[PDB]
């Protein structure tokens, strides 16, 4: 009557989302730019340190 032939593997899945990734990309780029600015600007101020 009704029967089955057991189990088989069908696919491999990735825990990925593009949208969150790309928002994080924009944020990371802008933040990196701001911190890069901060690094150098400090060096100028330290030249005024004393």
């Amino acid at each position: 009557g009704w029967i089955g032939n057991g189990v088989y593997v069908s696919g491999v899945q990735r825990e990925y989302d593009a949208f969150i990734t790309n928002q994080l990309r924009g944020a990371q780029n802008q933040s990196s730019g701001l911190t890069t600015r901060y690094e150098q600007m400090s060096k100028i101020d330290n030249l005024l340190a004393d």
Binding site: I3, G4, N5, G6, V7
Partner: protein, 50 residues
């Protein structure tokens, strides 16, 4: 001489039942899988003798 059919019917049903069991062992954690199962029944009764 019906006993040949009796024994061989039992053997066939046993093979079927174990196939169902093996199907379950295969599926034991497949998503959504449902417990699969087999069923039995006495053969039809002739009034062939006493």
């Amino acid at each position: 001489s019906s006993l040949i059919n009796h024994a061989m019917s039992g053997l066939n049903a046993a093979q079927a039942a174990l196939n169902t069991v093996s199907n379950n062992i295969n599926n034991y954690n497949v998503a959504g899988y449902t417990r699969q199962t087999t069923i039995l029944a006495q053969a039809n009764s002739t009034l062939g003798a006493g």
